[PDB]
């Protein structure tokens, strides 16, 4: 683990090269520490940032999705776009390469099957669908009482990382069905759920933990509530009803103050 | 060069327009070794008298002919002392040298797929659940002219499937290249040679009840005369057993 | 237990059939196919 | 006893997991394993065997052997003879040994081998352009536009066949087995370079095609193949 | 693990021995790589086919069979003939030698007995049948809640491999009861099920995993839906009702296109 | 493990000491192998009899007994005499020395007590009997859901083996209560069962596995269905009702054939 | 504690399985094992003894 | 078998726990990891970059 | 535990009776039968 | 098991993806940011 540096002693200084002057324009952050500004003592400083590294920061297994079994059947397309709090944390970065371990928290009872359906094929659309009988589609059978199912999905990119943001399109110029952003760039599969009993509740919570993460290009954190998934659209249409039609709210987190200089 | 000569004792093939020989699975026929053996009795090796080329009847290849198949060892059951050894023994094994022969002219066009299928299990000609009859899967040297797909094919008597596109077993022709095969393109070659070892999960079995291999000749592209009055060409098949063994001498299983 | 900067291949039921998948792979060549020729 | 813990996924039954199970029938002696010809240890060795492309699949010709060959004649102006859009999910490739091994896997990388053989008489001759339009390009619809991609020109005589290699050209490291516009693979098209000339005016010729994988071909993410469907119980 | 070969560099070449010419007739596949055709760069290629080897390909534990407990009793004859998706994957090969681990997924509760009945003897035909009392027939008692039963059956051949396809018969020429195909060639036993309680549902799913596989003679993959088991019959009779009597459908997976050359 | 011997080669032989002649009278089996009779080849033979040794043959944990809880109470006197299939396998031998592991398969629920009551004392005759409170009688408490109880009883002989057959009596000549056979020769204890709940079903199955077996004097296998336990009586009285009174059936497994020489 | 897992067939009772079980009656001393004539360690030694075929089995 | 025990927190699912889980899709080969510019291994490296304070935030 | 490119024979309950099947086999001969003769 | 006054890093499922968090950390520097200059 890496501890933060110690504070070194510093005395009075008369210097013709100010360290406290600079240029904000150059594009560089300040190198100034308290030894440049005040007169300091030696402090032996054992603090660590270990809990701020991208493995610990993104490694807590957030809830990605919720589904309800309707007629003892549910379906979920794997993605982080649906939940704002985990979507904001992934979007501090442009590119992420991670394995994910998927824990399924269900309040149902009896017996459940999860099918991981790899991209490019058809999933079971109901319980009792013949497609639940699969040679090569990986599935998980579990009894929700006595344990939570968990499996790891490795990194399935088509690229060396996942795009969190994608400034391109999947089709050429004149195509009218063009799709913008990361949705065409990869698909992580879908999870199909069914119950082989009736028993308990219908709620299925999918918790996902990124592990073995490599993050690439830091971005400004999301300053606005999300509106749609796979968008970046931050303009929110609160109501379709009437004269407030076509009125949009940004919904940011900036708060005002009565006066500068009085705070 | 394109010349080839294959001498299996007492008989000689000479092919002057020829491809390489297909050695199936890169494996020559061998005698059953002692490591792999099951039965305790000393087998017989007829060698030159059984191992030799047996040419069958020729088939007329025409516009609209769908193909032919032969079953092995079956096609040889009446042929020389090789066929005699099938009836007087419980078990037997062998490899085969299949030499297919079709020549036309530089004015003729056409293509034939000549393939050898291990365990080619046919499909019933259609409908309900019926085993194809022993009588139909054992035509002997005559083989089976494939007729073709029709709703009007007689479904009586447990008859085999007639459709060459599905290989009569329900799998696409055009994937038949996964088996030992050659194409006879009249533009290119007039013949084919495939050396198949003995293929089975068993050291020897009954020559009469089980057909190890199947030789299938499908007209991949039809036969065009060009400008000639020759609308049909013969196709002759010649089989040499090689390294054939027999054990369990008994009364002839014949009638 | 059955057999053996490390690794341990351990058979809990002491049968060769009771083991998991066989991951030790050597034998191969496409040439039995794709080039099944004498010369 | 020894303290243990049961993390999530301990009592699971995962269909794809690798575990040891108790032997029922202990002491059982399997029958000896003899030598059988043909042993195949990897299913990508089936995809590397040539198999015919049903290049002629159309309303009338599907279900017949004639779905594997195309007709070529002599023409005054170059025409686009055939198009093989490169998708392993397309019937053209999906029905082959190559494509039907690749349909068990969600995505693939590596190079394709396509071999064209002309079945004609020995006095027929021709030059053909076989072009591969790389991904992201438009299907050419002109031989000037087709020749600007990967292409070969095969003279016809005295050797039956010619092989265009479809090389691996991809932005990403893998291509999806199912066609999409993001990973799409491009097009193989057949053109007349000069002409197909038979010995007699109305003469004609037939072209077949086979595909196999190159040695660099690789697949991943085994899935169900769309190439089998069960609507009924087998009894 | 075996990685695919690297792409080597290649320049312009003037050669009097074309590698791109050949003969489709010889029965051999092309040796051509992109170094023969185009001008190439060195690519360092780490991809593996490990997931395509016959162990991984056939090693996923497909569903072989389903049975229903009728009067707290079920019976299943072990085979892969019933399920089309796993039957197609085994039939890429003529001969297979494998051990199989059998997992039983049941939605019943209480207490179940599985009896493995070796070939050649009589099985219990009902619950409470005296044959459920056995000295030497291996059985499994389990409670479906808290765990799934699993056992391994080794390779029981009578031969060195299983026949996937068998072109012979079990009886001589003149016998009228001749049976064609692999059904006489081996029998893997049957699984008898009974419940010693009532409790839960009646459904019993038998999942089987081939392990330690050796495959032999590659075959063309099945191009047509199956009709009967132990057949290869692909002609499907959709209805017995009326004038459509004796009309058969092949039911293949080939799809047409409007035009060649326009695709 | 011991593999069967290999078949050696043998040629034509002219010998003045026939190996195929002999005398059935001497009391010895034939030494003849196929090398004496036919002309043979070398066969490399890896087959084993490992599954036929007395440990594997008798080591499968058969069902010895069934009891029903009547008023949440059951009792069973340990013995193999009750079940014909395991009784026949033990009776291939005159003497057996084995430890036994006892598995209890019950369809009850809640809480059960098994008391092993050593010979010579009184057992609990009901639930709530004060004798269920024992200092030194070994008992087992288990909850039938989540696991099957199992314990090992070592070899309790009074002798060096168990008698499967005993040609003596426990009392002298003139005693009128004489008992014949193995019943006096040893008593393996009894198992008392009670339920401390009500809950599930009443059925208790006792499975016993001989282990560490030593078998002594091979006997002819039982050729007839058993009638009584601790008897060897094979004459079966089917009905007490009427004129068929005092008619006995042997009930053997020999089957006839229409003709010798025609089979 | 130590992380473990319970794969399928862990809580099973298989009639043919081979396992160790707790000894009831601990400290029990078995009676000594003397020499008895006839010890048979394999049941295929009974099949290798001649025995009469009921060749005349008929009505 | 070996005596074990299941202390409190053994069958738990803790969202922040660190554990190994079975790989679904075994044998899967990830796409190769190339060099990308900008790799950030700690989020405190974003806090050490200057960013403008909205000093004028008012109505 | 009780006792001992490897193998480990371990007794969990520390009794010889509590062990599983005895798989270590030496003693045998058919000749006690099939040839039970003086000379 | 997979690999290795002690420590033991043991992989139960024998896959690199199936492991827990990667706690071994070397690569770092803020200077890609905060000082992204030529000179």
Coordinates of C-alpha atoms in Angstrom, one line a residue, chain E residues 24-131:
Chain E
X24 CA -10.8 -28.7 -55.4
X25 CA -10.9 -32.3 -56.8
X26 CA -7.9 -33.7 -54.8
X27 CA -10.0 -33.8 -51.7
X28 CA -7.8 -31.4 -49.7
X29 CA -8.6 -28.0 -48.1
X30 CA -6.7 -24.9 -49.1
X31 CA -3.4 -24.0 -47.4
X32 CA -3.8 -20.4 -48.3
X33 CA -3.4 -17.8 -45.6
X34 CA -3.5 -14.0 -46.1
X35 CA 0.3 -13.9 -46.6
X36 CA -0.2 -15.6 -49.9
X37 CA -2.9 -13.3 -51.2
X38 CA -2.4 -9.7 -49.8
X39 CA 0.6 -7.8 -48.5
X40 CA 0.6 -8.2 -44.8
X41 CA 2.1 -6.9 -41.5
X42 CA 3.3 -8.8 -38.5
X43 CA 0.4 -9.2 -36.1
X44 CA 1.0 -10.8 -32.7
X45 CA -2.0 -13.0 -32.2
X46 CA -2.9 -14.4 -28.7
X47 CA -6.3 -15.8 -29.5
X48 CA -7.0 -19.4 -28.5
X49 CA -9.5 -22.1 -29.7
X50 CA -9.6 -23.6 -26.2
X51 CA -13.3 -23.1 -26.0
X52 CA -13.7 -25.1 -29.3
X53 CA -12.0 -28.3 -28.2
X54 CA -14.3 -31.3 -27.8
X55 CA -14.0 -31.3 -24.0
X56 CA -15.3 -27.7 -23.8
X57 CA -17.7 -28.0 -26.7
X58 CA -19.5 -31.1 -25.4
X59 CA -18.7 -30.5 -21.8
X60 CA -21.5 -28.2 -20.7
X61 CA -24.1 -30.6 -19.1
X62 CA -27.1 -30.3 -21.3
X63 CA -30.6 -31.5 -20.4
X64 CA -31.0 -35.0 -21.7
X65 CA -34.5 -35.9 -20.4
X66 CA -37.6 -34.8 -18.6
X67 CA -39.9 -37.0 -16.6
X68 CA -43.0 -36.4 -14.6
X69 CA -43.8 -38.2 -11.4
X70 CA -47.3 -39.7 -12.1
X71 CA -48.1 -41.5 -8.9
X72 CA -45.0 -40.3 -7.1
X73 CA -43.1 -42.5 -9.6
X74 CA -41.1 -41.8 -12.8
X75 CA -38.8 -43.8 -15.1
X76 CA -36.3 -42.7 -17.7
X77 CA -34.1 -44.7 -20.1
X78 CA -30.8 -42.9 -20.3
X79 CA -30.1 -41.5 -23.8
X80 CA -29.4 -38.2 -25.7
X81 CA -31.9 -39.1 -28.5
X82 CA -34.8 -37.1 -27.1
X83 CA -33.3 -33.5 -27.1
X84 CA -32.4 -32.1 -30.5
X85 CA -29.8 -29.5 -29.4
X86 CA -27.6 -31.9 -27.5
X87 CA -28.3 -34.7 -30.0
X88 CA -27.0 -32.5 -32.8
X89 CA -23.8 -31.7 -31.0
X90 CA -23.0 -35.4 -30.3
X91 CA -23.7 -36.2 -33.9
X92 CA -20.8 -34.1 -35.2
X93 CA -18.9 -37.3 -34.5
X94 CA -19.5 -41.0 -35.4
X95 CA -17.9 -42.4 -32.1
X96 CA -17.8 -40.9 -28.6
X97 CA -16.1 -42.3 -25.5
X98 CA -17.2 -40.3 -22.5
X99 CA -17.9 -40.6 -18.8
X100 CA -21.1 -38.7 -17.8
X101 CA -22.0 -36.9 -14.6
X102 CA -25.7 -36.9 -14.0
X103 CA -27.3 -34.0 -12.2
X104 CA -31.0 -34.3 -11.2
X105 CA -32.9 -31.0 -11.0
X106 CA -36.4 -31.6 -9.5
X107 CA -39.0 -29.2 -8.2
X108 CA -40.4 -31.8 -5.8
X109 CA -39.8 -31.6 -2.1
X110 CA -39.5 -34.0 0.8
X111 CA -37.5 -37.1 -0.1
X112 CA -36.7 -38.8 -3.4
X113 CA -35.0 -42.0 -4.4
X114 CA -33.2 -42.5 -7.7
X115 CA -32.4 -46.1 -8.6
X116 CA -29.9 -46.7 -11.3
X117 CA -31.0 -50.0 -12.8
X118 CA -28.2 -51.7 -14.8
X119 CA -29.2 -53.3 -18.1
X120 CA -30.5 -56.9 -18.1
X121 CA -32.9 -56.8 -15.1
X122 CA -36.3 -55.6 -14.2
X123 CA -36.9 -52.1 -12.7
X124 CA -39.4 -51.0 -10.1
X125 CA -42.6 -50.2 -12.0
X126 CA -44.3 -48.3 -9.2
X127 CA -43.6 -46.7 -6.0
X128 CA -44.0 -49.2 -3.1
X129 CA -42.8 -51.9 -5.6
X130 CA -40.7 -54.4 -3.7
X131 CA -37.9 -53.9 -6.3

